[PDB]
Amino acid sequence: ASPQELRRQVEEQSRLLTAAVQEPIAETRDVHIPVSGGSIRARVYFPKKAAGLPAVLYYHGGGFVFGSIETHDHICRRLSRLSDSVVVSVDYRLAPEYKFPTAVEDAYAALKWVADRADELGVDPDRIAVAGDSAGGNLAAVVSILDRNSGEKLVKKQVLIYPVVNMTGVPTASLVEFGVAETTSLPIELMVWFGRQYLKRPEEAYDFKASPLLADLGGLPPALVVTAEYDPLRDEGELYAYKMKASGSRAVAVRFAGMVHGFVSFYPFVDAGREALDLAAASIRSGLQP
Amino acid sequence: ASPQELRRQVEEQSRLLTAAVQEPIAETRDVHIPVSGGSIRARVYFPKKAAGLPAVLYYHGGGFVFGSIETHDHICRRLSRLSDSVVVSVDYRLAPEYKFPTAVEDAYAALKWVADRADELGVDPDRIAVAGDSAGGNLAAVVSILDRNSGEKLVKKQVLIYPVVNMTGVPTASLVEFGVAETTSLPIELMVWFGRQYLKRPEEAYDFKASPLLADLGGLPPALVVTAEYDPLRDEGELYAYKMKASGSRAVAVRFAGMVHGFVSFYPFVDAGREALDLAAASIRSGLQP
Amino acid sequence: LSIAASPQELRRQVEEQSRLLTAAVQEPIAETRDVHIPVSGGSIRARVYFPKKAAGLPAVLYYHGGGFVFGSIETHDHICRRLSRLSDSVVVSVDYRLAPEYKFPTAVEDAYAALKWVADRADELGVDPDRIAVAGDSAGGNLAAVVSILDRNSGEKLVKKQVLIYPVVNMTGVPTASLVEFGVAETTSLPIELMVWFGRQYLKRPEEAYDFKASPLLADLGGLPPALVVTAEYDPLRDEGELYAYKMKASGSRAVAVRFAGMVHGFVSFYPFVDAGREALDLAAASIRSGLQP
Amino acid sequence: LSIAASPQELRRQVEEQSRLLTAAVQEPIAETRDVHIPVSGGSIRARVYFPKKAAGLPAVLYYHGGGFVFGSIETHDHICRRLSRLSDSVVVSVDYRLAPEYKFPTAVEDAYAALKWVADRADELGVDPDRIAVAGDSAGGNLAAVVSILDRNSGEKLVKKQVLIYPVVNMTGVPTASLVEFGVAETTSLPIELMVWFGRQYLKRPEEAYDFKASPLLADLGGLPPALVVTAEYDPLRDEGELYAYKMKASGSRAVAVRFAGMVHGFVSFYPFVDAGREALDLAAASIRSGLQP
């Protein structure tokens, strides 16, 4: 099936699946963010009604092809509340329609937009983080490298939840192991698919904005990377952390037992995803303390 | 060297090592708890001045031979504060002086003492947890099984931080792997030592109060077990969790990369120990919500 | 399988299942002789495999797997023939008595007795008594490891080398990471439930699990004959197998552990169909050949 | 070692170091002949090892390891003699040209050329052209794997089997879990710094790392000759080695991967001193023997 039809299914599936969670929150404001060639949508979650609050940029997962604001709305509500920070979930553009660079560029613009319109949003400028799951973690990681290179220091902390950091063809042992098994949640055939729908040409994969791990990782904001024991992205996510730390950037990698890829997403239904969001939040909260 | 001299060294070492952390807190009350054949000491940490607060029983580590209230005072202060619960650190009796049963019995009495004198302590009875690191995790696990068997339901949540759950002679692969390496923090020779100083006879090790994992683990309070990638107790700690969950008891096992045994203890100096205490707390806090 | 059923009928289903395996391969061997070995209470069968016709030949005692309840000389006849011809050794496969009928140390005792029988009957066998090794798979590896310990405690030095194929060396409830990981998997050839059942059929009193003749890993493994330990990546026994080789080495005995990728417990029996079973068998035969050089 | 020093002098320290290894063992072989093989730009040396004196013998091309910068026929003379006598094959060790002097595809080209030379000179060699295999360790395994791919793309079917000992199959910066874990360890025989340096000495333009003749793992591994892949538990190359066997299998080619416990990269070279190096060598010789049966 066509990417458009898998996208409409994953959406139906997820809403259908989260017609129950009730994640309380304070205010939610839906915004529009100017990007090259138009605008995108974002949703800001206010934990309280106050001034100078920390802010987190959440980039949803979905292989650069799926996912939406609504798709990770529950996750963002709980974060906002548990970390007590504003969360601006970004509806970055999706592939095969908008190919590689694009998603990465809006994620970056979003971030920038969030710091310049921060009085408005009632957010503290010197206290902003970037989080994301799967393809979102990637964007969160790349965005963090753009902020580094740019030298604007907008990112103070990062939370990579099962990031894909290597889009090359050089597989990992966990990649193959959990990509092939008869009980994964992230078929190797589907990952190779994501890649095709997103990258124009495939050496684009050797680019640092596509594969964040191939980049020099010195000089980056403190990072919290979460992994799943039975996730094909496990080795890479954990290797991302090692590398940051070896290059002088602070990193902590926590791996949850018995979990599969995308488990935080089923948090209202799996305990481990609860303990993981609770951690993400606590990590953000301490990371953004003045 | 004699157990007494290793005990005086570990103490000097730790205080010496934590002459800096400043863990703020609200009030601390040092108590005396009646046990069979005398009394023991405990230290209660108040996070705020209030009524009906959740409470956590912290059992310090040290192989049933070392450790003290002062030795894990920093850890207990931060917990209290981050979880916003009372923490009563228990100076259970230590081996070769007081051998196996004893430590386990005071840990249990402590727990009981804490629920009956709870109006006094200003603590909520229906909201109590048990936490502990290394030998302390063991005690926390055993105490949780005593509460189960007893049927009093005093324990609502448990936080096993690198628990030793198998004191038998049936080694684990991680046990051997990280017990022998040229860079562990938990020499296999020293563990075999702990065992000798604590157990009278060595089949005592096959007893459930010595080796919590050999027990049937159905019907236990929700548990959060934390492991270290380079810890000889890793496999057992993670196996403890699997077993609880297989027997119908809820459990989540999180393993931190690059860490060694006893790392939370060096939290003010290692980031991963920070992220781990932050998690312990968040786990306790959600676990004790009415 | 289904342990819901009796051991004897399960022994039958297994027997038919395994012989479809020996049927698929033609393994030449210069000769065979079915023998009857004296043990306490009678005799057990044994099949002697002759690689060539000569004197002073090296020999290998082979103990078949089957969880102490299944298996027979027939069940592992292909493995033994191939083993025999590649190492150029006399292989004698032992039909040790089975549980639940005959319970634990029996088999161990039959095994050790079969070893003494070979050394005593070496001239009649065309064997060089100073050149003997022991080998086996699953429960068979246990027997081989225990037999090596018995041979050591006795100070006779009959066992010059031991080849343990996916051996079970720990029969207590203290699980390993691999024990549970592959014991519980949906794709397991050695379910945890079946392993638990083997023990109930084999041991009379659950604390016999603590005897070294049942859980060899609990013994002092120093001073043992050189060991070659073969394990499988998805075998629940994997960890205890490697733990055993390490422990031996740490105690001064020589041991080498090899892990076959992509394999499950019992893959050697399927050698005709699985390339890896065949590579494993060739390593074993080469390991024996070299271990038995004068 | 110290890469702070030049390649040529490091090549010397290594040469002396490795020959203390060949010195420790006496490995009989019916015969040897040092030969000179024609390649683009001249000739490379090769040493032919004859196991016995006969016609129609099976043969194995052997490519020594050394990170494409070190090693020589002398450096692996013991391994080849032993390999030769245990498989009963003619082994021809190739002295392929080294980097940095001669850079990447050279060695690959020397290797493939050495393979064609053996098949063409088989009658003069007492070899059965239909029974040839290739083998090697570290960079030598790379050459053997690449040679197998070249032999396949050519459709000549010269390679009947390939034995890859702790092969390096990926020369890009995309690390594996094992690559970093053992590359950075204090107890590593293959530091990450040295691996990075080998690549700079071997490749002229860093994106050649993406060519299949350098990073065989990137090729379509379907339709290749049977593979036996040997890895070590603490080898940084461990994961890519096993990844390679799996990929081959998933593509329809036959492959078997064996992981030796407690070993580091290069343990086979130390076979005289390490029991496991010896067991590994015997598996390889047995794997070739069986793979080359008519």
Author numbering:
A (entry chain B), B (entry chain B): 21 to 310
C (entry chain A), D (entry chain A): 17 to 310
Quote the study's own text.
EstE1 is a hyperthermophilic esterase belonging to the hormone-sensitive lipase family and was originally isolated by functional screening of a metagenomic library constructed from a thermal environmental sample. EstE1 is composed of 311 amino acid residues with a calculated molecular weight of approximately 34 kDa. EstE1 has a characteristic α/β hydrolase fold with nine alpha helices and an eight-stranded β-sheet. The residues Ser154, Asp251, and His281 of the catalytic triad are found in the canonical positions observed in a wide variety of α/β hydrolases.
The 2.1-Å resolution crystal structure of the selenomethionine derivative of EstE1 was determined in space group P41212 (unit cell dimensions of a = b = 73.71 Å, c = 234.23 Å, and α = β = γ = 90°) with two independent molecules per asymmetric unit, by single wavelength anomalous dispersion (SAD) method. The final structure of EstE1 displayed a nearly ellipsoidal shape with approximate dimensions of 46 Å × 47 Å × 57 Å. The electron density of the N-terminal 16 residues, which is expected to include the α1 (Lys8-Arg13) helix, was disordered. The cap domain consists of two separated helical regions (containing residues 1–41 and 193–218) and locates to the upper region of the central β-sheet. The substrate-binding pocket of EstE1 extends approximately 16 Å from the protein surface to the catalytic Ser154 residue. The sequence motif His-Gly-Gly-Gly (residues 80–83), which is conserved in the HSL family, is upstream of the active site. It is involved in hydrogen bonding for stabilization of the oxyanion hole formed by Gly82, Gly83, and Ala155. EstE1 dimerization is primarily mediated by hydrophobic interactions in the middle of the interface and is assisted by salt bridges at both ends of the interface. The dimeric interface is characterized by the formation of β-sheet between the two monomers by an antiparallel association between two C-terminal β8 strands. We also identified hydrophobic interactions between Val274 (on the β8 strand), Phe276 (on the β8 strand), and Leu299 (on the α9 helix). Site-directed mutagenesis analysis revealed that hydrophobic interactions through Val274 and Phe276 on the β8 strand at dimer interface contribute to the formation of EstE1 dimers and their hyperthermostability.
